[PDB]
Design a protein around this nucleic acid. Structure first.
Ligand code: FES
Ligand SMILES: [K+]
Ligand SMILES: [K+]
Ligand SMILES: [K+]
Ligand SMILES: [K+]
Ligand SMILES: [Mg+2]
Ligand SMILES: [Mg+2]
Ligand SMILES: [Mg+2]
Ligand SMILES: [Mg+2]
Ligand SMILES: [Mg+2]
Ligand SMILES: [Mg+2]
Ligand SMILES: [Mg+2]
Ligand SMILES: [Mg+2]
Ligand SMILES: [Mg+2]
Ligand SMILES: [Mg+2]
Ligand SMILES: [Mg+2]
Ligand SMILES: [Mg+2]
Ligand SMILES: [Mg+2]
Ligand SMILES: [Mg+2]
Ligand SMILES: [Mg+2]
Ligand SMILES: [Mg+2]
Ligand SMILES: [Mg+2]
Lengths: 97, 117, 128, 48, 122, 72, 137, 74, 86, 23
RNA sequence: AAACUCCAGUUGACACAAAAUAGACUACGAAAGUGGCUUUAACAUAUCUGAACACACAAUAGCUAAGACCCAAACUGGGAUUAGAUACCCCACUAUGCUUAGCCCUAAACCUCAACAGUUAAAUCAACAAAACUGCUCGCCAGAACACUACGAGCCACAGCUUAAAACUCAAA
C-alpha cells in the first residue's frame, strides 16, 4: 500500500526498568554491615522503603534478615553498631538541621 | 512517592478486604486549609525567674536587683517588638511558603475535575 | 513407606547413580529430604501399579491417586496435630473430592474404577 | 551435572578421620560475610 | 535437608574451643548429619549481654557449621545445644544458599489508581 | 517507524548530538538522521547483520568528517 | 577535626577529654521527667550517688511539681550538691516526656554544670505490659 | 488570552464580530433582555478555541445549540 | 538493659550549646517515630481504634502528598500575567 | 443511617433480659 | 483527696505476660482470623452451582477442671464531684484476659454489596453510597409494631442458643 505508514512494534526508546541498589544481590543475616546501613544510628529502627529506596522484595528480605540477626546474636537492636557508622550512606534521611 | 491506592478501597472486583476506610472521598479539593495559628506560650520566663530569684534573696528590695530587673524589662521590650515583627512577616508571607489566599487563587485556575465534560 | 535409602524421583534415572560414593547416595535419598519428596515416590508407585499409562497425569485415575496420597499425608499430619482445624478441613474436603472423582470414574470406566479401588484400598460407599 | 559437582564436593567434607585436623584449620582461619553497598549499587568489601 | 548452624561459643582458649567444636560436630554426626564445612567468623563482642548457664557473656566465638541432616535431627540437635555449657547461643536455619533467588527485571511503576469514584457531578 | 530502532541505538551509543536541533527548518537533518540515512544505504547494499551494519556506519561518517563521541 | 554528634566508643582511642577525663569517666545526671514530678540523680561513672533532688524535695506539692520552673529548681539543687563534690562536666540521661524534661537540664547548667552529651532513655516496650485504659473526657 | 488581540482585529478587519472576553451568563439565551427585544443574534459562531480557561467547553457551545445557531470550531 | 549504654539516642554537645543538642535529639526521636509512639502508649489504644487511626493517617498522607504534588506542579504558573489587558 | 431501629431492639432485649432475671 | 512509705532513684540479676520500628508494605487463610525468631508438618478440587435434613469450623465475652500471674481489669471497696452520682475523674483489688483439657456457638461475624462466567455499547443512572449491566445458580425478602418474643422441637447449652408465630393495635413505618 504505502511505505510511509506507521508500523506496529514495541517502544524502541523505552528505558530499562530501574533496579534497587540490592537487585540481584543476596541479603544474608550474617552480613551485619549491610543490614546496619538500613537501621537508624540513634535508635536502631528499621527504615521504611521510602527512606531506603529498596523494592518490596528487598525491603522484606532486609527486614527479615535484620530481625533474624538481632535475635540470633549478630546485630544490636537499640542502636546501630558504631563500627558501621562510617559506611556509605544509602538512605535518604538527614537528622542534623 | 505517594502511597499506592490499587486495591486499597472496598470496591466491586477487589477480592481482598479493604485496606483503607476513608470517611471522605480521596479526591483533591480546590482549596487548601487555612493557616492554623500556633499555640501561644509564655516567653522571657528565664529572665523573669532570675529577677524573682534576686527579690527572694534580697527581701524584695529593688536596689539590689537593678541589673536583673533591667534584664527582665529588656526581654519584654524585645519580645514585645517581636509580636509586631512576626505579625508583619506573617501577613506578608516572608516565612510562609505561600499564603493560603495566594495558593487558592492558583488552584482556582486549575480546578480538579472529578467529572467528565 | 518407601525405605529411606530410596533415591529421589529426580536422581533415580541419572546414568551412573549406582557407582557414586555412599555419602552421595545418602544426600540424594529420602532420608535427607522433606516428607513432600517421599510423597512423590509414593505417587509414582501407585501410578505404575494401577494406571495403564503412568505418564498421563491428567487422567481421572492419576488425579484420584494424587489426591489419595495427599489424603494420607493429612491423616498422618492430624495424627500428631489433633487440634489443627485448618488441616482437618483440608482432609474432609479432599475426601469429598475423591468421592466426587470416584463417582465420575465409576460412571465412565467401571473396569478402571475397580482397579483404582483395589490398588488404593478404597471401599466405595453410596451416599445416604 | 549436579551429581558430578556434588561428587567432588564430598571429598572436602568433614569426617571422623579429619575432624581434629579440620577443627584446628578452622581456628587458624577467618571467614568474613560483611560487605557494604553504595548508592551506585557497588559492593565495598572490608579492609582485610 | 541442608542447614546452617550459627554457633556462638563461650570465649575460651584454643584447646577448649577445639574440644567444643569437635564435641558439637560429633553430636551432629551421631544424629545422622553429613557435615559439609566449618567456618570461623572470629571472636567479637556480642551485640548485647547474653546470660547462659548461670553466666554472663560479653564476648563469644562465632562459628558456622554447614551440614545436611534428616528433618528429625534438627529438633534433637537443638536440645543438645541447650545443655552444652560452652555454647552461648546456637540456632539452626535452613541454608541460605539452597534458596535460589528469582531473577528481577526491575521496578514496575505503579500508576495512580483510576475510576475509584463515579464521574457524576458532586 | 523502522528507523526508530536505529535512533534508539544511536542515542544510547553516541548520545544526543552536541549540535542543536532546529525544528523551524522543515528540512533539518540531525547527526542521528544522517546516521540513519547511511545505515539505510548500507542495508540496501545487501548487508543484513545488525551489529556489523552499525559499526560500518560510524566509520563512514568519520571519513566524511562527522564527530561521533561515544558516551561511554 | 570535624565535630561528631556520635559519642566516643569505649575501648577505642579518642582524643576528646574533659578536665583530663575521658567520656567513660564523666559523671552521669539521671533525669526522670514524669508527668507529675521530676527526679534528678547525679552519679559517678562507677555508679556512686553524688546528689539527688526532685520537685517534691524542693518544697513543691501536687500540681506545682509537674511544671517547668519546678524542675528547673530541682536541677539547681542537685547541681549545687554535685558541684560541692567536684563535678563540673556531666552526661545527661533523661527518661520521660514530662514538663521537666528540658527545664531540669537548664537548672543543671544554671547551677554550674557543663553538659557534654544528652541521652534519651525513655522506656519504649517492643510489644510489654498493657497500659491502663483510655480516659473518657 | 494569548490570541484575544489577534482575534479581535481579524474580526474587525473582515467586518464581523468577536467575543474574546469573559462570557456572561445569557448573552445568547437571554439576549432580548440584555440587548433589547429587537436584537439580532449571530447566524454563525466560529470558535477558534472551544474550551474556557478552566479547560471545560465554552458555555457558548451549549447555548449556541440552544439558540439553533450553527457553530464552526477548531 | 543488656545493650551497651551511651550509644542509643545520644547526642554530643558542641561548644556548650545544649539547646541545639536537645533540639537535635528531639528531632531524631520525632523522625524515628519514638515521640508519637511514647505518647500513644500512655493509655492502651484498643486494636479497633488503632486500625481506625492508622487508616486515617494513611489516607491523610496520600491526600497531603497528592495535594503537595499538585501545588509544586502548578507553582510555575504563579508568574505575572503575560496577557494583561486581554 | 440512624440507629433508631437498633434502639427499639436494644430496649426490647434489655427489658426481656431483666424480666428473665426477675422471674 | 484517698492510697503507699520494707517507699523512690542508680546498678545488677531475673517471665507460663505482650510482641516498637519494618508496615508509605497490602500479603496469607473458607470465614473467624493472622505482622518477635527458628525448625518440622502444611495451605482441598484439571467444569461450575449446590446441604437450614448433614459435616467441620467460627472474634470477644462466658461455663467446668487443673495451673501460671508482670500488667490490665467487670464486680466490689475507698477518695472526689453532684440536688443525687448505683456514673463520668483518682487509688486498691478480684472474676476475666494466658496455658492445658473439655464446653458454649454468639457479633455492626458488615467490605451490611452471594458463587461462577462475561461486557463497558446501547437508555449511563430515582437519591446517596463503592459507575451501569448481562448470563446462570443457590439462599433470602413481601406494611409497621407485637418480636433477637410466646409455644413446639433440637442442643454437654438450664437466667442459654437455633428455628420462630398469632391475637389485640396503627395509617403509617
Ligand atoms: S529491584 Fe530487583 S530485587 Fe529490588
Ligand atoms: K515485636
Ligand atoms: K505499623
Ligand atoms: K449474625
Ligand atoms: K462494617
Ligand atoms: Mg462514612
Ligand atoms: Mg451520622
Ligand atoms: Mg419495645
Ligand atoms: Mg461446590
Ligand atoms: Mg468461639
Ligand atoms: Mg476463656
Ligand atoms: Mg494492677
Ligand atoms: Mg487475676
Ligand atoms: Mg503468650
Ligand atoms: Mg470482622
Ligand atoms: Mg449479613
Ligand atoms: Mg453460595
Ligand atoms: Mg465476575
Ligand atoms: Mg412484616
Ligand atoms: Mg441475640
Ligand atoms: Mg428466645
Ligand atoms: Mg421454649
Amino acid at each position: 500500500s504505502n511505505e510511509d505508514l506507521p508500523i506496529s512494534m514495541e517502544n524502541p526508546y523505552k528505558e530499562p526498568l530501574k533496579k534497587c541498589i540490592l537487585c540481584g544481590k543476596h541479603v544474608d543475616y550474617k552480613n551485619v554491615q549491610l543490614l546496619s546501613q538500613f537501621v537508624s544510628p540513634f535508635t536502631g529502627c528499621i527504615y521504611g522503603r521510602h527512606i531506603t529506596g529498596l523494592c518490596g522484595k528487598k525491603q522484606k528480605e532486609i527486614t527479615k534478615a535484620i530481625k533474624r540477626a538481632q535475635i540470633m546474636g549478630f546485630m544490636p537492636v537499640t542502636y546501630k553498631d558504631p563500627a558501621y557508622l562510617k559506611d556509605p550512606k544509602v538512605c535518604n534521611i538527614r537528622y542534623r538541621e | 512517592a505517594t502511597p499506592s491506592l490499587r486495591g486499597r478501597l472496598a470496591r466491586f472486583g477487589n477480592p481482598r478486604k479493604p485496606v483503607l476506610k476513608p470517611n471522605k472521598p480521596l479526591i483533591l479539593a480546590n482549596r487548601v486549609g487555612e493557616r492554623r495559628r500556633e499555640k501561644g506560650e509564655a516567653t522571657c520566663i528565664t529572665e523573669m525567674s532570675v529577677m524573682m530569684a534576686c527579690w527572694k534573696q534580697n527581701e524584695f528590695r529593688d536596689d539590689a536587683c537593678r541589673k536583673e530587673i533591667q534584664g527582665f524589662l529588656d526581654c519584654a521590650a524585645r519580645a514585645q517588638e517581636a509580636r509586631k515583627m512576626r505579625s508583619i512577616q506573617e501577613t506578608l508571607g516572608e516565612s510562609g511558603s505561600l499564603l493560603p489566599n495566594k495558593l487558592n487563587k492558583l488552584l482556582q485556575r486549575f480546578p480538579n475535575k472529578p467529572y467528565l465534560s | 513407606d518407601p525405605p529411606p535409602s530410596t533415591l529421589l524421583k529426580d536422581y533415580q534415572n541419572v546414568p551412573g547413580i549406582e557407582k557414586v560414593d555412599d555419602v552421595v547416595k545418602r544426600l540424594l535419598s529420602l532420608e535427607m529430604a522433606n516428607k513432600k519428596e517421599m510423597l512423590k515416590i509414593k505417587q509414582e508407585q501407585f501410578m505404575k501399579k494401577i494406571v495403564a499409562n503412568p505418564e498421563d497425569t491428567r487422567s481421572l485415575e492419576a488425579r484420584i491417586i494424587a489426591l489419595s496420597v495427599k489424603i494420607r499425608s493429612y491423616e498422618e499430619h492430624l495424627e500428631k496435630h489433633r487440634k489443627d482445624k485448618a488441616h482437618k478441613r483440608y482432609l474432609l474436603m479432599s475426601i469429598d473430592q475423591r468421592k466426587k472423582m470416584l463417582k465420575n470414574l465409576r460412571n465412565t470406566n467401571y473396569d478402571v474404577f475397580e482397579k483404582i479401588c483395589w490398588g488404593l484400598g478404597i471401599e466405595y460407599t453410596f451416599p445416604p | 551435572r549436579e551429581v558430578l559437582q556434588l561428587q567432588e564436593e564430598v571429598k572436602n567434607f568433614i569426617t571422623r578421620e579429619n575432624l581434629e585436623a579440620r577443627v584446628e584449620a578452622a581456628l587458624d582461619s577467618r571467614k568474613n560475610y560483611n560487605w557494604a553497598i553504595t548508592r551506585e549499587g557497588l559492593v565495598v568489601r572490608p579492609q582485610r | 535437608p541442608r542447614y546452617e548452624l550459627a554457633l556462638i561459643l563461650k570465649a575460651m582458649q584454643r584447646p577448649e574451643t577445639a574440644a567444643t567444636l569437635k564435641r558439637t560436630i560429633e553430636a551432629l554426626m551421631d544424629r545422622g548429619a553429613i557435615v559439609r564445612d566449618l567456618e570461623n567468623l572470629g571472636e567479637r563482642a556480642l551485640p548485647y549481654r547474653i546470660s547462659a548457664h548461670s553466666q554472663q557473656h560479653n564476648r563469644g566465638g562465632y562459628f558456622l557449621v554447614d551440614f545436611y541432616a534428616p528433618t528429625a535431627a534438627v529438633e534433637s540437635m537443638v536440645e543438645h545445644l541447650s545443655r552444652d555449657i560452652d555454647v552461648i547461643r546456637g540456632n539452626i536455619v535452613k541454608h541460605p544458599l539452597t534458596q535460589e533467588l528469582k531473577e528481577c527485571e526491575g521496578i514496575v511503576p505503579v500508576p495512580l489508581a483510576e475510576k475509584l469514584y463515579s464521574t457524576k457531578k458532586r | 517507524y523502522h528507523e526508530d530502532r536505529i535512533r534508539a541505538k544511536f542515542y544510547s551509543v553516541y548520545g544526543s548530538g552536541q549540535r542543536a536541533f532546529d525544528l523551524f527548518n522543515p528540512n533539518f537533518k540531525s547527526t542521528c538522521q544522517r546516521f540513519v540515512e547511511k545505515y539505510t544505504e548500507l542495508q540496501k547494499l545487501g548487508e543484513t547483520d545488525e551489529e556489523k551494519l552499525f559499526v560500518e556506519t560510524g566509520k563512514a561518517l568519520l571519513a566524511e568528517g562527522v564527530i561521533l563521541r561515544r558516551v561511554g | 577535626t570535624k565535630f561528631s554528634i556520635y559519642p566516643p566508643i569505649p575501648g577505642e582511642e579518642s582524643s576528646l577529654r574533659w578536665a583530663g577525663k575521658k567520656f567513660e569517666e564523666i559523671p552521669i545526671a539521671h533525669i526522670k521527667a514524669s508527668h507529675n514530678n521530676t527526679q534528678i540523680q547525679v552519679v559517678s561513672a562507677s555508679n556512686e550517688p553524688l546528689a539527688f533532688a526532685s520537685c517534691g524535695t524542693e518544697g513543691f506539692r501536687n500540681a506545682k511539681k509537674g511544671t517547668g520552673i519546678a524542675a528547673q529548681t530541682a536541677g539547681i539543687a542537685a547541681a549545687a550538691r554535685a558541684k560541692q563534690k567536684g563535678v563540673i562536666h556531666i552526661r545527661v540521661v533523661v527518661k520521660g516526656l514530662g514538663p521537666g524534661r528540658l527545664s531540669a537540664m537548664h537548672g543543671l547548667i544554671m547551677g554550674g554544670l557543663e553538659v557534654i552529651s544528652i541521652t534519651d532513655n525513655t522506656p519504649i516496650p517492643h510489644x510489654g505490659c498493657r497500659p491502663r485504659k483510655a480516659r473518657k473526657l | 488570552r494569548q490570541f484575544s488581540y489577534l482575534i479581535e482585529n481579524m474580526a474587525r478587519d473582515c467586518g464581523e464580530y468577536a467575543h474574546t472576553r469573559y462570557f456572561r451568563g445569557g448573552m445568547l439565551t437571554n439576549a432580548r433582555l440584555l440587548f433589547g427585544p429587537t436584537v439580532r443574534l449571530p447566524d454563525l459562531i466560529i470558535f477558534l478555541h472551544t474550551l474556557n480557561n478552566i479547560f471545560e467547553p465554552h458555555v457558548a457551545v451549549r447555548d449556541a445549540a440552544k439558540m439553533n445557531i450553527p457553530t464552526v470550531g477548531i | 538493659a543488656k545493650h551497651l549504654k551511651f550509644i542509643a539516642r545520644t547526642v554530643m554537645v558542641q561548644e556548650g550549646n545544649v539547646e541545639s543538642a536537645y533540639r537535635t535529639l528531639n528531632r531524631i526521636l520525632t523522625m524515628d517515630g519514638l515521640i508519637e509512639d511514647i505518647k500513644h502508649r500512655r493509655y492502651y489504644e484498643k486494636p479497633c481504634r488503632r486500625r481506625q487511626r492508622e487508616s486515617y493517617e494513611r489516607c491523610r498522607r496520600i491526600y497531603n502528598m497528592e495535594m503537595a504534588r499538585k501545588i509544586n506542579f502548578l507553582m510555575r504558573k504563579n508568574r505575572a500575567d503575560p496577557w494583561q489587558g486581554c | 443511617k440512624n440507629v433508631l431501629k437498633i434502639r427499639r431492639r436494644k430496649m426490647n432485649h434489655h427489658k426481656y433480659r431483666k424480666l428473665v432475671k426477675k422471674t
